[PDB]
Amino acid sequence: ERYFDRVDENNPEYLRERNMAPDLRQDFNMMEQKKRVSMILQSPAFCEELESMIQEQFKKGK
Amino acid sequence: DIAALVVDNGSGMCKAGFAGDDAPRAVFPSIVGRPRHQGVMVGMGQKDSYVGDEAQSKRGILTLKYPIEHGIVTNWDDMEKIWHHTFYNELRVAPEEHPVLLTEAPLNPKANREKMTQIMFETFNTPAMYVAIQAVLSLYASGRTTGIVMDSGDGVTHTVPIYEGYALPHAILRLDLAGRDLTDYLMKILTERGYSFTTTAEREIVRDIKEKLCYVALDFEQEMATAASSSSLEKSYELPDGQVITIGNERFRCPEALFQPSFLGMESCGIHETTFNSIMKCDVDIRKDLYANTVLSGGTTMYPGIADRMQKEITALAPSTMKIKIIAPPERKYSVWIGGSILASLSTFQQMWISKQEYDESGPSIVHRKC
Amino acid sequence: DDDIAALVVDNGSGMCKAGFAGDDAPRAVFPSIVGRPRHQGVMVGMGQKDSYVGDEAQSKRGILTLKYPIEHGIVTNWDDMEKIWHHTFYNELRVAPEEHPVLLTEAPLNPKANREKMTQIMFETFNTPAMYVAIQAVLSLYASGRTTGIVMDSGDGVTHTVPIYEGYALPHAILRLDLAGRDLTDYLMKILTERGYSFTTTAEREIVRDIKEKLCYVALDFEQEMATAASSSSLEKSYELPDGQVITIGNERFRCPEALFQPSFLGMESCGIHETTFNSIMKCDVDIRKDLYANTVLSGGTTMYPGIADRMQKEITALAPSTMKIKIIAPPERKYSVWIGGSILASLSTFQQMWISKQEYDESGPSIVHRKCF
Amino acid sequence: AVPNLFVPLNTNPKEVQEMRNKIREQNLQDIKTAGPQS
Amino acid sequence: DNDNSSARLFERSRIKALADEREVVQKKTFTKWVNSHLARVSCRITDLYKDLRDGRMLIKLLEVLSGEMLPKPTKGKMRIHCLENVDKALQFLKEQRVHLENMGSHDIVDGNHRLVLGLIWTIILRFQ
Ligand SMILES: Nc1ncnc2c1ncn2[C@@H]1O[C@H](COP(=O)(O)OP(=O)(O)O)[C@@H](O)[C@H]1O
Ligand SMILES: Nc1ncnc2c1ncn2[C@@H]1O[C@H](COP(=O)(O)OP(=O)(O)O)[C@@H](O)[C@H]1O
């Protein structure tokens, strides 16, 4: 009995599994396979450049 | 651990997610549906209006309308409904506890930013909210600080060049040629095959057809000759009612309106010519980098063969000594949100947030002071 | 409120059913006929009875002429309808009409004067505190228990198809056909002539109806069954008349209900019931059709022929595209289904808001029924 | 307009199914009850 | 034939059972109500269906309830005199403008349960 093992209405964040489009099913898996947001933050050389660029663009204007 | 929220809005798609996450938590169309048929069944579930993913399920009994067209909102109440559904039903988080990050088109009227800020502080009691440019965030998601970016959504197409983290306001080019107009053109050219689609649900069906069975031709006349002289370029779509249609010749005809707007009769030039003109408006010294870094963004640029045709059309107008290359990330649909998820995560960005208390003495114009 | 239960009255052309809300089965089921004597009355002291109504009108049908107050779902004679309602309320249920509200059913596409006169009669004479009028095919979906589906209701007076998706009914896709078991009884009475049997009086029509209810079925293939009936005598069956005579129906058994699928046997230009259901499906929007294909619901006493569901499924499958899955839902209790739905509708706590009060009728005349109900 | 004129809005669909199931259950138990006393 | 058998099962079990329970309860209650008023004179009925056939007790009950003098019953023990005695009570009810529908003397004499119960119920609705 898999059907007794779990219930669709017990967990809403398991209920999200049923109502997915197939291309939406790939987009999440591929995008957390890539981990781009983790890559940008973990890599320093681009990171402090972005840091200081935002800070000193605030410094003179906007 | 209070974390910021990134909410990306575009005409036809709303995404939302916590800052610092790889994936947005919620993705759903920006649709509002109201019942059209006489509802007679006492005691069962009826509602005044359906919104989001639930509204798309019941397309048969609903009239579906979009609150945003061409990047400009038409009815603010529907926008409030979508924002409330995003904050409460999708993420189940209080809007007044976490800061929220918002995006918009670069060129837009004055009143949009002010009304958006007023609604976001007054209705939801957001402690801090910031407005950012979509295409700039897409370039940050690509991870280069320089280059010219092309973001083409379902509302409007725009190319902006960014050099050293600054987007030049004079060189920004905007063209009102989007995917919804392509859907209308595809419906008009499917009329002549014998299949007729008129209602809004049939427009969504035509949009799904366009997403599944469209591609960009490398040579337009040669592909017309091949499609006229043979039946190889024919695919069959299977309708939700069981009917089967043959898309046939039209597959490369609908996206080609992106390059030649004379099919739609628009006065403006093609998208590649728009990108070339935007590059021409910049200074000479940076033009090399503008020809060296070009990324594609938006769901409209997911047609197969868009990169090769774009590169060829840019190389045709470019000088012979210039080197042309086109960068197309596979996740170009959700690049903008990813950039937002970068921008809220920085340690220098906490001072960039708009203060709730400062808005009290400033007012709705405060964003024009700070952004 | 808790102990008081509104009366549920299903009022078709053939038979009338009545009971209390919250009950699984109706208390009183009896035919809707009004009979009057025609012969001499010579025995003095037997008493005078002007009219016979209901089941005991059937028992003494030998010396009576029988009239149907409802023809094609329309109340042609209203005095006989008052007789039937009085016999239902007092003799059958033994309830005072002032105590409980009344729930009534009717056909989808009917003249407005029928509804107005129903409201006027149930307020002015029986003096009811509240009353509601509903559609039978909508109540069939309540009895089925599903939100979406297409209901084909075939009674003694009229057949009609309504589609409902997610509790929303489409008025433009509702179809009405004047082809029911009444015309089938007339057709059987016509085709029994060629075997030598003649039934002409109104009393013999009930015998023909009993013969139809006992010895009729729907062939899955018409031409093959006709060839089988011509080749052999295994299809023949025997029936016994009330006077002891024996008749043999033989070939006619699958020819009487076949007029439902081919109306050209009756001279009608209309389409069959399967084509009517298919056309009602394709009159709806594109998206819901799949769901309307999966939840076809049969109802009414006319759909009690053996083998009706298999033939209907085969015809719909032949008409529909092959990639869709076609199933026909026919409960064994499909004769009473409408009434059950009425009880389910009558016992809801929400529906207590939707009753038509007597004060509203006093303010608005008999025209209040169109603004409420459906 | 007025598409929802004949029905009230914001009603739980579960209650109708529960009461239909109760009427269904009455048949299985087949408890015999008299009519309401006048 | 299987679904036909199931339908016959349903309309043999539930429709019969509910109606029989209701009519048994109504029979007991009507018997008590008639016995209360009929005890003023020295009269008592054990069965509602059987003792009301001859038509004498109906005349006695109507005489007790109404308060005036009905015509005395026809002196006989046949079926015709029985019909006459029931018809006298029915005609006296036709005086009081009480509305009776599908009610005849032979229906009471033969002993149809539903029509006798309806007659008693109509009398109760009038004379209470
Ligand atoms: N897989 C796909 N292939 C081709 N076109 C697509 C695909 N997915 C979406 N589109 C087109 O892109 C549009 C959605 O663009 P989107 O990225 O949502 O714009 P925005 O987010 O700026 O509103 C749709 O109208 C559709 O026509
Ligand atoms: N067991 C049966 N088999 C076949 N046909 C039947 C059966 N019972 C009834 N019918 C047909 O149905 C008719 C009665 O239908 P009914 O359910 O009374 O309709 P309504 O209640 O809507 O008036 C009869 O005239 C007869 O033609």
UniProtKB/Swiss-Prot annotation, chain B:
CDD domains: ASKHA_NBD_actin. One of its GO terms (molecular function) is protein kinase binding. Keywords: Acetylation, ATP-binding, Cytoplasm, Cytoskeleton, Hydrolase, Methylation, Nucleotide-binding, Nucleus, Oxidation, Ubl conjugation. GO terms for biological process: adherens junction assembly; apical protein localization; axonogenesis; cell motility; cellular response to cytochalasin B; establishment or maintenance of cell polarity; morphogenesis of a polarized epithelium; positive regulation of double-strand break repair via homologous recombination. The modification Tele-methylhistidine is found at H70. It is an enzyme of class 3 (hydrolase). It catalyses: ATP + H2O = ADP + phosphate + H(+). Transmembrane segments: none annotated. One of its GO terms (cellular component) is ribonucleoprotein complex. Pfam families: Actin. PROSITE patterns: ACTINS_1, ACTINS_2, ACTINS_ACT_LIKE. Polymerization of globular actin (G-actin) leads to a structural filament (F-actin) in the form of a two-stranded helix. Each actin can bind to 4 others. Identified in a IGF2BP1-dependent mRNP granule complex containing untranslated mRNAs. Component of the BAF complex, which includes at least actin (ACTB), ARID1A, ARID1B/BAF250, SMARCA2, SMARCA4/BRG1, ACTL6A/BAF53, ACTL6B/BAF53B, SMARCE1/BAF57 SMARCC1/BAF155, SMARCC2/BAF170, SMARCB1/SNF5/INI1, and one or more of SMARCD1/BAF60A, SMARCD2/BAF60B, or SMARCD3/BAF60C. In muscle cells, the BAF complex also contains DPF3. PANTHER family: ACTIN (PTHR11937). Actin is a highly conserved protein that polymerizes to produce filaments that form cross-linked networks in the cytoplasm of cells. Actin exists in both monomeric (G-actin) and polymeric (F-actin) forms, both forms playing key functions, such as cell motility and contraction. In addition to their role in the cytoplasmic cytoskeleton, G- and F-actin also localize in the nucleus, and regulate gene transcription and motility and repair of damaged DNA. Belongs to the actin family. In vertebrates 3 main groups of actin isoforms, alpha, beta and gamma have been identified. The alpha actins are found in muscle tissues and are a major constituent of the contractile apparatus. The beta and gamma actins coexist in most cell types as components of the cytoskeleton and as mediators of internal cell motility. This is Actin, cytoplasmic 1. It comes from Sus scrofa. The gene is ACTB.
